[PDB]
Design a protein around this ligand. Structure first.
Ligand SMILES: *C[C@H]1C[C@@](O)(C(=O)O)C[C@@H](O)[C@@H]1O
Ligand SMILES: [Cl-]
Ligand SMILES: [Cl-]
Ligand SMILES: [Cl-]
Ligand SMILES: [Li+]
Lengths: 243, 251
């Protein structure tokens, strides 16, 4: 069970590499997109919460259009990370759903990130809106303080599947090396027993680095890199793939 | 607590890379020793059980000498892997112990591998002999069929510490990806609660490859790579191994 966007097959082969744009304004986003021409990666994520003028739907869509036109052939993921889940600024639930609906129906993005804990009515409505417009949903959950039990994490990933996520995603903060193994254990249980679509998981920080490298083994379909450095990430993924 | 051999500090920093040399005869051993000089690794293991003149103690020591001649500054580990534990040929227990004692008292090698389940009295006697001649002991155990429980693996590693091993070592065979996590769990439990010296662990085969890469995270002090041919399933090209170890170390 895969998700194919612009010839990229998510959920088989090597895990796919996501890089994120974090600029404040149009000029900074253009500069980042230009700098990223020299990099090799699979999916471009726009981290909208790093943008300054998020109040104006027009401003957000204009930036989305610039990014889309800068890299017309790359899978493009629109992500507003709420402060609630480790992002850079707050947003009202209603304005979050306005920006996401506008991104969806504009045709400018291939995927959106939708936080599981936004609220059930809003999640279901936004999943239906995305699907109706041929946009995929990465349904996401983040704990930047600690690592829940494996049982709790698996139930969250299963709930995302039940709510229609195309790709469930969880990211958690280890407070010990043991916590990294708990995240890998949850990942593998999902992979082997409950998943019927691609899943993304990660243990954050230095301690969790191995989780960003071992997705082909334990069942994570994608991983985030920086322009871990993207070239080093690709080196390790290739070595593991061919071992 | 660490083990330092010819300036290499085992138990600190990046896991140390071991490669196995596997020649059938003296001429092949010579040739492999010369060729290995340009590969980059931390410890050379001579897999003595691949040598087809083990019948002669002189032949075995001459082969060790040829390796030492070619690589005077490399930590050198003498390993006869018994047939019982996945090696190439069956020899008597007394023959196994004689070869190890001769290696020890020759001065040609820095370390020997001694299998835990050789028998407690023979193990103790051989550890004592090694230490009397300034040779370190990698005490080892292998399960080439399955992965024991994390608790059974920890039991064995702790027994090796109790018998005076300088570096306990266990290698086990995964039948599933779950079994790989079990090996990593046992490794970490040793690092955090029981180990008071360096320990080497690995899950073998393709499924276990991540365990050969993640030693710095979970507490395995060394890892095996392949120069041209692997000495156990799941070993990858030594340069690729080194690349991954460096990326993990510096992340
Ligand atoms: C210690 C043992 C480990 C291997 O079995 C392995 O890398 O899996 C290779 C052998 O040559 C070593 O003796
Ligand atoms: Cl709004
Ligand atoms: Cl489900
Ligand atoms: Cl993330
Ligand atoms: Li994120």
């Amino acid at each position: 069970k895969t998700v194919t966007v612009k010839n990229l097959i998510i959920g088989e082969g090597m895990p796919k590499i996501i890089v994120s744009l974090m600029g404040r304004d149009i000029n900074s986003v253009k500069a980042e997109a230009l700098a990223y021409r020299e990099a090799t990666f699979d999916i471009l994520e726009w981290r909208v919460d790093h943008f300054m003028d998020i109040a104006s739907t027009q401003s957000v869509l204009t930036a989305a259009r610039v990014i889309r036109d800068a890299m017309p052939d790359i899978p493009l993921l629109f992500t507003f990370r709420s402060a609630k889940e480790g992002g850079e600024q707050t947003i009202t639930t209603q304005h979050y759903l306005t920006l996401n609906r506008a991104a969806i129906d504009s045709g400018l993005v291939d995927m959106i990130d939708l936080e599981l804990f936004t609220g059930d009515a809003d999640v279901k409505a936004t999943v239906d809106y995305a699907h109706a417009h041929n946009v995929y949903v990465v349904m996401s959950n983040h704990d930047f303080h600690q690592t829940p039990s494996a049982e709790e994490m698996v139930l969250r990933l299963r709930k995302m599947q039940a709510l229609g996520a195309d790709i469930p995603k969880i990211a958690v903060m280890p407070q010990s090396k043991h916590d990294v193994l708990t995240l890998l254990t949850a990942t593998l249980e999902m992979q082997q027993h409950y998943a019927d679509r691609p899943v993304i998981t990660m243990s954050m920080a230095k301690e969790g680095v191995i989780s960003r490298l071992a997705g082909e083994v334990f069942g994570s379909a994608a991983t985030f890199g920086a322009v871990i450095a993207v070239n080093d990430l690709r080196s390790v993924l290739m070595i593991l793939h061919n071992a």
